[PDB]
Symmetry: C4
Subunit: 394 residues, 4 copies
């Protein structure tokens, strides 16, 4: 009477019936019911109910009934305790905040890391680099052409290839367009080939890489076909396309999607927006305050000879002090503008220290997130897959 013994894997557990009756609906509440012999396994010889579960972790679950607080043991992994409490019918959202972050720690990372007879032949040839042997060579050729185009784009801006000769203006070397045309013909061939053999055309269009590639390809054709009449409009649009040429520097992301580190970095960035917002707010407040202080401190040494007190200082006003504050708070220190008054040097020292602290605040959080994600992702490489040795249904 009022005493019940629980046998969990050969380990006896003894408690009062009243304590088991605290939480209704749960399996233990069913066990506290007097007519539960036909429900659970029970032997009248020992008068103890039998289970088959981990005996070292049932203690915390029972202690939740005994006291009222739910905690997770630190000697077992999170998923193991989660499964164990799921079996007994305890809702996992009742654990105390003292031991919540470690509990829901691996699950978030795990879920974030996972968040026409020839059409299969053609589509797999261009998409998966290692689905075959030829796809590797195609990917390497694309890498070569991308690097060539980027190199040409960087060279076009140099003064050696832009002689001065409209009266004078300046012209780029002719072959710097021929190389670009050689790259463009291949890029057009590849884009046209893949847009035909892609299932779910609308999904293909919705992708950002495809539109980036199309936008990169278009200006060459526009320029080569728009060298005729309408002088004003032609000259405006040619300058606009000359500016927009930069979009072909973004094609490098097309072939770097297969690198593990970049995917880990992308997940880290997507999972750490709040820290970026916090860092931006901290920097804004610090920059504003220190710019105001450094502006007002440098006016002490104002010479009593000029109508404008800003002749002996680099800090003519506050907005120009924003730049100095940003440079100084990150320990960069270009040196183009620095305090020159005994009162300004104290503010400079304070600015340096405050910048160090306010930068060191959230960066460790971001770095820890990246480290955890990277470790988890790199663990997958060591263990490819197994053959599910544990056959269920004993």
């Amino acid at each position: 009477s009022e005493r019940i013994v629980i046998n969990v894997g050969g380990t006896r557990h003894q408690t009062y019936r009243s304590t088991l009756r605290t939480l209704p609906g749960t399996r233990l509440a069913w066990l506290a019911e007097p007519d539960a012999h036909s429900h659970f396994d029970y032997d009248p010889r020992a008068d103890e109910f039998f289970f088959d579960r981990h005996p070292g972790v049932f203690a915390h679950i029972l202690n939740y009934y005994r006291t009222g607080k739910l905690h997770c043991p630190a000697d077992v992994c999170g998923p193991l305790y989660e499964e164990e409490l799921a079996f007994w019918g305890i809702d996992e959202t009742d654990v105390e905040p003292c031991c919540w972050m470690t509990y829901r720690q691996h699950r978030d990372a795990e879920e974030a890391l996972d968040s026409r007879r020839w059409q299969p032949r053609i589509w797999a040839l261009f998409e998966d680099p290692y689905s075959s042997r030829y796809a590797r060579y195609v990917a390497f050729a694309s890498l070569f052409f991308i690097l060539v185009s980027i190199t040409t784009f960087c060279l076009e801006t140099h003064e050696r290839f832009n002689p001065i000769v409209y009266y004078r203006e300046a012209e780029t070397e002719a072959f710097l367009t021929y190389i670009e045309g050689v790259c463009v013909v291949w890029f057009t061939f590849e884009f046209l080939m893949r847009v035909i053999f892609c299932p779910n055309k609308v999904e293909f269009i919705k992708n950002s890489l495809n539109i980036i590639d199309f936008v990169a390809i278009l200006p060459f054709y526009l320029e080569v076909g728009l060298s005729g009449l309408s002088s004003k409009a032609a000259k405006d649009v040619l300058g606009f396309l000359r500016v927009v040429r930069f979009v072909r520097i973004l094609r490098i992301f097309k072939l770097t999607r297969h690198f593990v580190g970049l995917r880990v970095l992308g997940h880290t960035l997507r999972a750490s927006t709040n820290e970026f917002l916090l860092l931006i707010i901290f920097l804004a407040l610090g920059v504003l305050i220190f710019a105001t202080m450094i502006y007002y401190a440098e006016r002490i040494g104002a010479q009593p000879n000029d109508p404008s007190a800003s002749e002996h200082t680099h800090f003519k006003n506050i907005p120009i002090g924003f730049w100095w504050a940003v440079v100084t708070m990150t320990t960069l220190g270009y040196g183009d503008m620095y305090p020159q008054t005994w009162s300004g040097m104290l503010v400079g020292a304070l600015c340096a220290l405050a910048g160090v602290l306010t930068i060191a605040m959230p960066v460790p959080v971001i770095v820890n997130n990246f480290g955890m994600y990277y470790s988890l992702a790199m663990a997958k490489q060591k263990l490819p897959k197994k053959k599910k040795k544990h056959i269920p249904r004993p």
Copy 2:
């Protein structure tokens, strides 16, 4: 005789009666008393006293009796062990320093994070941003006006808006005062409205935000009403108020009290004064020593032609060397003053290394405190509240 058995949740614990008698007053001391059968639950069939507690944590409490030292197990949370030792009557202030910081770790953070029929309608409309729908719009309007006033304050100091025309002096653009007046009429309206419908007027006055707002509002009225006679006094007070204009840059803190990160930062700053004092002392000692050394090192290359040996160096004396030491110890390095002698370069290298070390000493402590506070505070957002499932009194 001299042998007793303790049953803690189905787990047998056996010890001599003498060991239980070490600590008087405690529940175990009562248990060691021969006439305790009427006090505690006891069955003559098994001759063991019965309890209902966690069996895996009673071992450490009993070991405290057995040896004399009190330690906390590392497989359970701090609060769980604290409650368990509280039940048995053991004072928590007796644990050894080897395992004290982890024990009293969550409690400090938890306590620090928590450290006229229309008057309710009016007061809640201005104070709580999200107590209703209109309060959100009022807060947004206040944000707009605050940003406008700050922008005008920053613009007033620029040279483009201060043409030179008393003989010449300089004047600010007229509309830069009209915008400020438009902001200040709203600010006056809001401040006057809230000061009427605030319960506990003295508490309202004691708040720093209200006095900041009043001090920000006052100078505009003083200037607009004090443009008359008494030329000397008027000209002095106008300059004084022109200086004090900066106080309206502090109203940004009025609406940032609702951001979680800033509250966490405030708690971190309030809980880490000792580390700031330590950092300041370290920096002072380093700056003094290295300024002296760099002053004395640069005099080796003194040219035997000038009465003052400080003509070939930036280090004319020690106080000017304070600035170089501060700049160099934080890896900032403006470059306005640097050593130029073979003996000074060694001191410069030593200064850089010592600065790195003496900065890296306490900053990790401060950062760890901030990280723990931020994690605990952010855990609250995920779990709003529950319905107290565990009904007491079994």
Copy 3:
């Protein structure tokens, strides 16, 4: 029937026969066999099988059968659990990724840290510094000569020792060759002595230190013997050898192989190639993007008077912007080139912040690896060796 009890070191474990039959081939599968009494120790009085193993760690192994997932307890060391699961016949490559990195953590470090009657007398005299008393003195003499040669090599490039006097050219001081000859005779003696008394001559040649030493010695002889005819060839080869003189600065690695810290650093570098690759890729992407942005941002303030818009800026093109991006992303900030336009300062601030983040990403991983390796290596110094007290075969 369908119920079995396992006795592991005095601790009863109870489970159904069906659960033990999940994994075939394992020892428990043999135990589930009905005719296992003649195989394992078993007493009909208690009807329980007896073992001699740790009872606190068998629970997780049995739980692997009960649920299907394999985890490692956090209350015991990795090697202990590894040995325990090896005894029971469980393959260690089945543990979940949630608890894999900590499991295979010490093993990798441990394996990485371990990855003619006079010939023994002569060879040990030069190789092992502390195999005797004389070897210490020989090593010290070699250190002295190496330092002298390095000092002379550094001095040869100074202008004080290179007076101008072929019509003018320049000549080095004579004694700067005599000191080198004095060092070279000893180095030749040592190298000749060790190459004779080295077993496995081909292995000796395969070593990098020996070829480094030979390459360092050779140019002195070549120069001292090649000051004759064939003016053109002699003058070319003399300049080439003057350039190659630098190889004698690498002999310092010959005597630093015995320092523990350098060996730990070598192991850390060899074990962290992926992080270096990741860091290089991140830096390349950041430098490219920010160089492009800073080039395009500075052209806003182009003066409408010059054909080339790059007259008011340091950023004449993109390749020169690579250098500024590299300098700025590491918070170095020489200051030789900095933005001077309101649009360029925003890009500069973004570049500084992005550089800080992208550097702080993988460096903690590398540092953690070094710290673990160094701690493990320094643990060996405290404990030299023992006398294997535990005699096997009880």
Copy 4:
């Protein structure tokens, strides 16, 4: 026969007699002896030996017998396991390196943190600041005078107080000597007073603070008494003492010995010599290598017009490159010398990255040591002392 049962605090432990016989001399070896009934507590009714010890930690000690390896559980503190293994007679120096650093972790810190009827009245008045009420005021007066002397010493070097008037030379202001004399009379009084009432005079002399104070006091008397004849010797010694004046800046350490942070820093420095040596060696190697590389890289752009190729570069030689390497490897970047050739910029980038890595290697070790020491020392402030409630001898 061949089977024994051990009762450790109510927990049954069962093992073969042969396993207990592995380690001789230990208490378990005595227990394996057949004639041990008269030695240990034993009851023939249960045929089990009884002990009074922690049952959860005896498992690892027994497992040491079972397998041969000794490990420490991670669920208990180091001192608890140390005491437990000390009781059973196991030498603590046999634990494996896999779990040695955490075991011997608290002990090292704990031991390092602890490594004439009026004579008691007088001596305590000057030494202990808070042994009384007057000692506090005496310490404050000493602080005031020390600060005044340091301020005067710093002011003496400024140009404002050194007018030019031997023909011209320069003289310091007269009162800058009177203030020093006022400080010196008090310092002499204090030093003379304490040197009389100090027990163990030789120990008093052996202290560094006393000799520092005496050396600081002496030059004032020497100067004030040595303004007479022997012009050459007087003028030499006066300059020497003018140089040695700096020793009075070190008296600040006299009163900072009572600050907790400085004592913690001293212990950290004394306990981390190896890391400093490692850091110095790393920096030396890096500086040498990168100085050589940057010297040889800048000679590519040598103009074919000058005899000395070092006219277009800051890197005239290697020793001057040492300074640039030191400045660049710490991300300081003064900017007084920087590469100006496309080949030198690559070396500069490599130097910056290598410097960051080689600095970030051992600094975390040093910082972790400081943090542990500081936490342990600061824990003492919270818990002053107790009254040893646990009375031994049950």
